[PDB]
Amino acid sequence: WYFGKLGRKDAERQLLSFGNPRGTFLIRESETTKGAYSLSIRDWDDMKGDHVKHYKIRKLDNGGYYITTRAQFETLQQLVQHYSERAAGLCCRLVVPCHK
Q1: Which of 4, 32, 41, 89 could cross-link to 68 by cystine, CB 3.0-4.6 Å?
Q2: CATH number of the domain located at residue range(s) 1-100 in this protein
């Protein structure tokens, strides 16, 4: 998963640079809330067939992270691996390898 500190520019640009399908994701941190991040996946309304969507994430009260309450985790790595099984309430599952 995530290569470093990118999400706004690099992420949105790279995601549309190849045209990578469902499964492509990356994690970027939120500037507006330290300790929070945003999950960047390539999601489109299927007519544009090219877009990038960002999910606003909130920090768990137990010190973990979650996108939904049906999928709460203490580490972000474990979170990636669960969403790598299926979409736990995201438009895309996290099933791609990370190659730049």
Answers
A1: 89
A2: 3.30.505.10
